[PDB]
Write a protein that binds this ligand. Structure first.
Ligand SMILES: Nc1ncnc2c1ncn2[C@@H]1O[C@H](COP(=O)(O)OP(=O)(O)O)[C@@H](O)[C@H]1O
Ligand SMILES: Nc1ncnc2c1ncn2[C@@H]1O[C@H](COP(=O)(O)OP(=O)(O)O)[C@@H](O)[C@H]1O
Ligand SMILES: [Zn+2]
Lengths: 243, 243
């Protein structure tokens, strides 16, 4: 119902809008989203996450927000805040077609004044995540995918979408690329790993990162305490002017 | 189109029909299917695989069968054989609603005389994999799922389906449960691992196995040479009368 100009006055308080996509599911898009929200929060920045993954909403579960309950004030629908860092989260999970539901998350929700709003788009490069791009129109987007699945095609299907909304591709994250034995510190690289840096150099992308399969990030993700995850794989993410 | 009694004379040559299900995708259902077909083939047994995963058919790709091409003889639709071990494979992939397509794979295809016919059901415990059970009616089925997702509920949704077709639950496979550093041999167990043996003991299941995240099985799976994968995680699978 929210007017297309009603969003304007709402997002005018959001300094930068980042979108997190993936060639598919399992790649770990939502977990990465979480870590980029935690990265920016721990730095003192005000972060907001807009869970746009209707298929499989894992954002609320990563921050122990199973207490799905949306309250409404003058500002509108109050997004539940994570306890530890206080990051604002809005997911349809808190409500026990889609083109308009994101329009509402952008106009009715009270994101207040925050520097970043990470949008956790649905998996894939199809229309589903396309519609969200249309109404959101992020300033930057991050491509998330596993090593064994980081084709130049997919990476290009991404650079493609970012065109229909004119959104800069901020970087590429190669999730679950290697493994480090805590016993000796050895690193065993999975087949196809290393394809991130090459694609990035090829398509002129600035940021690149390789998050290994960390048994700890899996432990805390399930317990809903992903905010206590100490290792920061984004402690090199370039400045993004959020004025 | 095949009559429901036409299958009878067809499956009368198949000694045992095993079904491989999963609480969802990514769990590695199709890869496990492949290894159980390779396990039985390397032992001299005649194996047949019926790729029933329309959503994401990975069986043909695991055996380098991208040469999708179904030939038809007196016997009917000739299933393409894997080069190394000669396992018969039938997938809709070789053809560039579903309730009847499996009926055809059971009546038109020429499985000849084989001891085992592994069926790679679609992911999940919904209706999709249910319909396949109705027409197939396996003698045994194997539950495949990741450690972090092996709830007693899901394990029971399985024991449930096996009832509507009266099919014995042969065992539970905990895929990607741990990791072994080839440097020192250390084992790092992922969060939630070990839930297989417990569920099994609880529900009275005989076979149980834990296949670790093996960078090698990932290498050969992509190259379409999963038949060269030397480690046998089924070298303890109980005998199964297939006369
Ligand atoms: N680096 C990692 N190490 C270990 N487990 C991981 C890692 N990245 C993701 N996971 C786990 O993989 C599963 C899928 O990731 P998820 O973020 O849910 O994917 P997506 O958003 O595409 O559906 C979850 O159990 C998640 O916690
Ligand atoms: N033990 C393992 N070690 C490494 N990679 C694995 C393992 N099991 C599965 N994989 C990989 O995980 C992905 C998903 O498995 P898949 O069998 O395709 O799942 P599903 O049958 O449920 O669709 C594939 O890339 C597969 O090769
Ligand atoms: Zn080691």
């Amino acid at each position: 119902r929210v007017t297309d100009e009603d969003i304007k006055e709402r997002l005018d308080k959001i300094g930068f809008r980042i979108a997190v996509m993936s060639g598919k599911g399992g790649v770990g898009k939502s977990t990465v989203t979480a870590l980029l929200a935690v990265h920016y929060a721990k730095q003192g920045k005000k972060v907001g996450i807009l869970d746009a993954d209707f298929l499989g909403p894992s954002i609320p579960h990563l921050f122990g927000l199973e207490k799905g309950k949306v309250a409404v004030s003058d500002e509108g629908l109050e997004p539940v805040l994570t306890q530890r860092l206080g990051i604002k989260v809005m997911s349809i999970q808190f409500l026990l077609l889609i083109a308009g539901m994101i329009r509402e998350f952008l106009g009715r929700v009270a994101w207040g004044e925050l520097d970043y709003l990470l949008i956790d788009l649905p998996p894939g490069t199809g229309d589903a995540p396309l519609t969200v791009m249309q109404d959101a129109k992020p300033n930057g987007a991050v491509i998330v995918s596993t090593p064994q699945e980081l084709t130049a095609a997919v990476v290009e299907k991404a650079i493609t979408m970012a065109e229909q909304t004119k959104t800069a591709v901020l970087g590429i994250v190669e999730n679950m690329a290697y493994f480090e034995c805590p016993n000796c510190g050895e690193r065993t690289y999975l087949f196809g790993e290393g394809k991130a840096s090459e694609l990035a150099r090829k398509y002129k992308i600035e940021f690149i990162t390789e998050i290994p399969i960390d048994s700890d990030l899996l432990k805390l993700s399930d317990l809903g305490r992903v905010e206590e995850y100490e290792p920061d794989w984004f402690e090199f993410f370039p400045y993004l002017e959020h004025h």
